[PDB]
Design a binder for this molecule. Sequence first.
Ligand SMILES: *[C@@H]1O[C@H](CO)[C@@H](O[C@@H]2O[C@H](CO)[C@@H](O)[C@H](O)[C@H]2NC(C)=O)[C@H](O)[C@H]1NC(C)=O
Ligand SMILES: *[C@@H]1O[C@H](CO)[C@@H](O[C@@H]2O[C@H](CO)[C@@H](O)[C@H](O)[C@H]2NC(C)=O)[C@H](O)[C@H]1NC(C)=O
Ligand SMILES: *[C@@H]1O[C@H](CO)[C@@H](O[C@@H]2O[C@H](CO)[C@@H](O)[C@H](O)[C@H]2NC(C)=O)[C@H](O)[C@H]1NC(C)=O
Ligand SMILES: *[C@@H]1O[C@H](CO)[C@@H](O[C@@H]2O[C@H](CO)[C@@H](O)[C@H](O)[C@H]2NC(C)=O)[C@H](O)[C@H]1NC(C)=O
Ligand code: NAG
Ligand code: NAG
Ligand code: NAG
Ligand code: NAG
Ligand code: NAG
Ligand code: NAG
Ligand code: NAG
Lengths: 366, 285, 126
Amino acid sequence: TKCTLKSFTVEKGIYQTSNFRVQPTESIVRFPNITNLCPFGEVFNATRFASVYAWNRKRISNCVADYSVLYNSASFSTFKCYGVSPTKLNDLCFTNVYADSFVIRGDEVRQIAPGQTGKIADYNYKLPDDFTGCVIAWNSNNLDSKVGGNYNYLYRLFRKSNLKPFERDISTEIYQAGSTPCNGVEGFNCYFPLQSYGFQPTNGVGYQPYRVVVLSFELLHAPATVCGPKKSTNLVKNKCVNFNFNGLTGTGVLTESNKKFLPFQQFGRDIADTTDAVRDPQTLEILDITPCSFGGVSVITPGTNTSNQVAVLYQGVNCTEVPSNVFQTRAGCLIGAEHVNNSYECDIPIGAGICASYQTSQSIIA
Amino acid sequence: QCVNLTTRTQLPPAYTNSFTRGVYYPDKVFRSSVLHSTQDLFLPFFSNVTWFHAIHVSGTNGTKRFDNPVLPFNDGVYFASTEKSNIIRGWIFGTTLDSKTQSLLIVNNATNVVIKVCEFQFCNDPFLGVYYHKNNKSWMESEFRVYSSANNCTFEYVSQPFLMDLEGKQGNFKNLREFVFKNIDGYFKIYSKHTPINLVRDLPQGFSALEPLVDLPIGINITRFQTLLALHRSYLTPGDSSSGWTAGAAAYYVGYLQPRTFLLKYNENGTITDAVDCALDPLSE
Amino acid sequence: SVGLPNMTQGFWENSMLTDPGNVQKAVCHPTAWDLGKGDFRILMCTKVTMDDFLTAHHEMGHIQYDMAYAAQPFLLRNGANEGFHEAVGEIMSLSAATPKHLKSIGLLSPDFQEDNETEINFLLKQ
Ligand SMILES: *[C@@H]1O[C@H](CO)[C@@H](O[C@@H]2O[C@H](CO)[C@@H](O)[C@H](O)[C@H]2NC(C)=O)[C@H](O)[C@H]1NC(C)=O
Ligand SMILES: *[C@@H]1O[C@H](CO)[C@@H](O[C@@H]2O[C@H](CO)[C@@H](O)[C@H](O)[C@H]2NC(C)=O)[C@H](O)[C@H]1NC(C)=O
Ligand SMILES: *[C@@H]1O[C@H](CO)[C@@H](O[C@@H]2O[C@H](CO)[C@@H](O)[C@H](O)[C@H]2NC(C)=O)[C@H](O)[C@H]1NC(C)=O
Ligand SMILES: *[C@@H]1O[C@H](CO)[C@@H](O[C@@H]2O[C@H](CO)[C@@H](O)[C@H](O)[C@H]2NC(C)=O)[C@H](O)[C@H]1NC(C)=O
Ligand SMILES: *[C@@H]1O[C@H](CO)[C@@H](O)[C@H](O)[C@H]1NC(C)=O
Ligand SMILES: *[C@@H]1O[C@H](CO)[C@@H](O)[C@H](O)[C@H]1NC(C)=O
Ligand SMILES: *[C@@H]1O[C@H](CO)[C@@H](O)[C@H](O)[C@H]1NC(C)=O
Ligand SMILES: *[C@@H]1O[C@H](CO)[C@@H](O)[C@H](O)[C@H]1NC(C)=O
Ligand SMILES: *[C@@H]1O[C@H](CO)[C@@H](O)[C@H](O)[C@H]1NC(C)=O
Ligand SMILES: *[C@@H]1O[C@H](CO)[C@@H](O)[C@H](O)[C@H]1NC(C)=O
Ligand SMILES: *[C@@H]1O[C@H](CO)[C@@H](O)[C@H](O)[C@H]1NC(C)=O
């Protein structure tokens, strides 16, 4: 009060000094349930895979891609994410996802990478210079290997020109290396384009089958349909906290309300366009949003020449949110004044018909 | 697959007036007796909407009407169909309606709502007729001539199967099915509402707030739509695939939206009970 | 310890390093199998003697040379001449038969003195 009035002698009366405000204790973020994750549970555990020249592109558009189950699993040999960090995969949205599944030899897995060249890249499947996605590969020598030679997987070896990024060729015309035209039959420079691979159960590292898939992420003029799985928190009702209900934000105490919303309405607003009620996206219950307690701090004190005792008043603040008698008045919580049942002339006006005075072993009374 | 429909009497288009309809919830915000005023694309009160009907009179008289033109899609449309039986079983949205661009297909084949977003090749007269036989006498839906092929599908949705009451009752109308389509930010919003009524003259008079039903993120452009009707194939009506048709008790209205200002009124529970147009009848201003 | 990589995974699960006996007939001649598809195995009935101890290092050097030149087409997966492939293992077998290596591994006693008579005898035998 001395600093507010800029004087060492404070006269008898009530003076406003500061403003009280209940600071938020913790912050909660709530989101709806995460069901029907993606067809990733079937695109990785498929029993049959296609060749490298006939790779299948599965439509992954509308499903919550759970990248945590793929990054935490310690069953992938090569896991390199280009243009994006593996940890930030569950914090960004995308438009369309495509998983190209195909089996390739182990010693030539390094050819499927941006900026790399070789024999399988420019002839079977080539990646652009810039790529926004990850690569997943795992050894499949346990089940994709039979005694006698596995001639079920083939690959395109001979081509007349380089392939474009994300290009798939179906025509299997015979290659021509010389000036003599190939009349549909093999000859000197007329060879078959497709060549079969040999997968034996006794082969060493490098020649074993490795099921490698490619994830492609693209962003165009369309609403994002695939996002990362956001995690919720616990619901704490009766305390000043920071809430986040599916994009919303603010600060207030969440008390159980009785406003029966409509089956499609999410949050409610009272007059003057203020968010006062939201629905929990998980339990579908409604609750009110009351702002946290705040108000001016007034210090009732007599003259400095009389005494140095003071009475603190929190205007419009209940006594249960303040943290030497503590008495609750209709004007606010008053601390430092003894409430008496007698009636005297109003000396220091407080409010709501209550006044304070410095009388009788000697303290401020209300 | 594409089969035309000949022997159809042409008539000038009819018009009616929608007194107070097309009012939908602009956003998912609960309001309890606050009388909010919003600025969005609604249907103006007492507008001039088009009336498409399908009448068929027995004998060598009457008119054979089967209305399903390619109507434009100007900033949203209002579809209200006074149906006696299940005849209107879907719509078609798009710009080119061919393999050039993509098109939205929301069609019902008597099982459930089937929504597909691909580059179809729609015919010039798509329909989903019924077949009425003498043995196993029950209205069955065996007809699909909407498009020829389907390639480059982006979005698809087929809900759980369900029965369909294709009984061709005779009498008055039973219910009204209202729909408000709008696409401003890629999302295709649909606002549906079901209200029983017992008139066969014009659009019912009253007030009913349309609630949001689905929100499909497609991102495609929509400039012209078309309504898909049903047909009846029974005895005493011989003909080829492009003839021998019959219908009746089928009518749907189409109204275009425009930027307007409305003073929506909410009750103690959050439902819109009344509204006024600020750009008409200055008593409402 | 010199710089050569470790053995392959199939080398420890496909090699028959012990004579099965009378259950089946198998030749115990030390041979270096160069399959060419990442699998390398040695066929030898290695006993607990010293001659077999150095022949094992000879075969391992052969396998190392095979894995070294396995990074070339089939028409080149071989030594430079007809003597290098054997010499690569022979030099290892000669350098591994030294008493210093045997006493460093734990075969020869550390307190064994290196007299010149044994060195002269070894040089004469070589
Ligand atoms: C393929 O099948 C395996 C075997 O069930 C799956 O591995 C399980 O994954 C769940 C989900 O995290 C774990 O709770 C189990 O402990 C895993 N089991 C084993 C034995 O590891 C695997 O997740 C499946 N693949 C995909 C893509 O879902
Ligand atoms: C979201 O998930 C929670 C928990 O997985 C669901 O809450 C359950 O609801 C059922 C039926 O109402 C109760 O029998 C369970 O006791 C609830 N469990 C818990 C932990 O509360 C909730 O219903 C789900 N919401 C949606 C929309 O699917
Ligand atoms: C009969 O059906 C055919 C297709 O089943 C349609 O013919 C199209 O007619 C329009 C103009 O009349 C042309 O622009 C199209 O090119 C025609 N289609 C084809 C594939 O050529 C039309 O619905 C009906 N045509 C007639 C003459 O009745
Ligand atoms: C209505 O259309 C839906 C989808 O166009 C049909 O559902 C398909 O039915 C076939 C065989 O009846 C199945 O092989 C498909 O798998 C179904 N689709 C899906 C997405 O599951 C439905 O059968 C049609 N109903 C009628 C009466 O024609
Ligand atoms: C303060 O809180 C208590 C407990 O909830 C309540 O009984 C009392 O009425 C409150 N005071 C005021 C002024 O609202
Ligand atoms: C004032 O009156 C109340 C209610 O009768 C009583 O509980 C309280 O003790 C009284 N205080 C004094 C100081 O008499
Ligand atoms: C609706 O428009 C048509 C054509 O412009 C016109 O003939 C008709 O009279 C109009 N109806 C009303 C009620 O104005
Ligand atoms: C039964 O229904 C089928 C329609 O699938 C129809 O073709 C047939 O004529 C009906 N009657 C008999 C006896 O099959
Ligand atoms: C499908 O249509 C979209 C429209 O933007 C286009 O980008 C895409 O390349 C098309 N895909 C195929 C396989 O035609
Ligand atoms: C339709 O919307 C698309 C948005 O992807 C836009 O590219 C196109 O130009 C629009 N068409 C017209 C005629 O404005
Ligand atoms: C509002 O809801 C209450 C209880 O849910 C109900 O008694 C009352 O009839 C409702 N009012 C309207 C206009 O629907």
